[PDB]
Amino acid sequence: KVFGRCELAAAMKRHGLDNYRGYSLGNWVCAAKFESNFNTQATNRNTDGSTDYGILQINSRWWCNDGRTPGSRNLCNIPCSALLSSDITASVNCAKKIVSDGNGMNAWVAWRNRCKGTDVQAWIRGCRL
Ligand SMILES: O=N[O-]
Ligand SMILES: O=N[O-]
């Protein structure tokens, strides 16, 4: 599923991401835009053999099991394919564990490089929230 901007904002808010660990809703929408272009089916291979999955490009090296990242962890206790569903529950719940990890949203390379220190509120402008 490819989400609309305000559609994803609303779903993320419903799932309790707005101000989760102090990160406003705009931060999450911005991250999702630049990680996956709002596409739940997005996948990208990393140099180390792991893969990033879903709207927030959650990585198999630590967070999920894709059956092909040998010697990795499954800290969210899920198959990586769960991160590709039209239902974003699994992605959101795993993201909450990631952002609590100690590095906050810096865990997302695209957020650090493209969202951090910018007017992230613009990502929810016009939405009926
Ligand atoms: O959800 N369309 O911005
Ligand atoms: O649960 N919203 O995909």
Domain ranges of the chain: 1-129
Three-state DSSP class for residue 115: coil
Q: Which one, of 104, 113, 127, lies nearest residue 21 by Cα?
A: 104
For the question of residue 87 being annotated catalytic, the response is no
Question: In the chain, count of helices (H) and strands (E)?
Answer: 4, 3
Cβ(64)–Cβ(79) under 8 Å?
yes
Longest dimension (CA), the chain: 45
Distance CA 91, CA 58 (A): 8
Question: Which residues line the pocket of ligand 1, CB cutoff 6 A?
Answer: 4-7
Do 2 and 38 meet the contact criterion of CB atoms below 8 Å apart? yes
Ligand 2 centroid distance, CA of 9 (Å): 10
State the DSSP code for 39. B
Q: How many angstroms is the resolution?
A: 2.0
Q: Which long-range contacts link 21-25 to residues 24+ away (Cβ below 8 Å)?
A: 21/96, 21/99, 21/100, 21/104, 22/104, 23/99, 23/104, 23/105, 24/120, 24/121, 25/123, 25/124, 25/129
Tell which residue, 81, 79, 38, has the closest CA to residue 56: 38
101 is annotated as contributing to ligand binding: yes
Q: Confirm whether 7 is a catalytic residue.
A: no
Positive or negative, the Cα torsion across 9, 88, 33, 20? positive
In the CATH scheme, what architecture does the domain 1-129 have?
Orthogonal Bundle (1.10)
